[PDB]
């Protein structure tokens, strides 16, 4: 099987082992609200999570997308109810990781009691060892290389550069199947968030026009990694009505990159 060596069942069944390659644990917060249940399943194993529980990413492969079946549930006075089902994706780095949901079924709002087929893709948690804004490198520049992944497309390539003297970053997404998702990530400032985490929020561009927004956290004690997401907006227009109406579509992209080791001497 092509998933041999993926460690999916191991992730669902083993306790934390401090000998495993990091990131060892991914705390679930955005991925499962308080009071709900998230059931994951793969390779014959299953485990249910609540808000604050951690996934054992130490058992998964670095720099790849790991895939699990999921069922989102709530228990209401004795009855276990399905809210949503589909594929749960996890992308692991050494100091950071992220999750995402490919929905396939949701609760039906036109015929109550039923599940209905519906495809949608969203980002879950962005997790890891946040770099403090107040302890960043004081100068120089670093280049990060990694992955951009969206709905049915884990092949995108992320390049991103941070100038620590200017406290600014910029980069680009290449090689996604859908051409309008290969956007530039415009120059944007590093700022501290409410927990002093170093975070970058800016615009995305396509042939020089503004087409949405992105956010990246910086991770690791020495700013080794970036992780976060982008949102690409597309406007759709009527062609067959006298009334000119629009509809806006949003497509989400998960983002993760790392600095590469460079050839060096010890003398
Ligand atoms: Zn421990
Ligand atoms: Zn670390
Ligand atoms: Zn949004
Ligand atoms: Zn040399
Ligand atoms: Zn060395």
Author numbering: 74 to 308, 308A, 308B, 308C, 308D, 308E, 308F, 308G, ...
What does the paper say about this structure?
We exploited soluble fHbp peptide V1.1 as a molecular scaffold to display the PorA VR2 loop, P1.16 (VR2 P1.16). VR2 P1.16 (YYTKDTNNNLTLVP) was inserted into six different β-turn regions in fHbp. At each VR2 P1.16 insertion site, a single amino acid was deleted from the fHbp scaffold. We determined the atomic structures of ChAs with VR2 P1.16 inserted into position 151, 294, or 309, all of which generated PorA-dependent SBA titres. All ChA scaffolds align with good agreement (route-mean-square deviations (RMSDs) range between 0.447 and 0.614) to fHbp V1.1, demonstrating that the fHbp scaffold is not perturbed by insertion of VR2 P1.16. In each structure VR2 P1.16 adopts a β-turn conformation that extends away from the fHbp scaffold. In ChAs, the VR2 N- and C-termini are effectively locked into a 'biological' β-turn peptide mimic by neighbouring fHbp β-strands, as confirmed by our atomic structures. SBA titres were detected with antisera raised against fHbpV1.1:PorA294/P1.16 when alum was used as the adjuvant, and with antisera raised against fHbpV1.1:PorA151/P1.16 (a low level of SBA from a single mouse), or fHbpV1.1:PorA309/P1.16 when MPLA was the adjuvant. Interestingly, there was no detectable IgG1 binding to PorA using sera raised against fHbpV1.1:PorA309/P1.16/MPLA, against which two mice had α-PorA SBA titres; instead this antisera contained significant levels of α-PorA-specific IgG2a and IgM (p ≤ 0.01 by two-way ANOVA). Of note, antisera raised against fHbpV1.1:PorA309/P1.16/MPLA had PorA-dependent SBA titre and contained significant levels of α-PorA IgG2a and IgM.
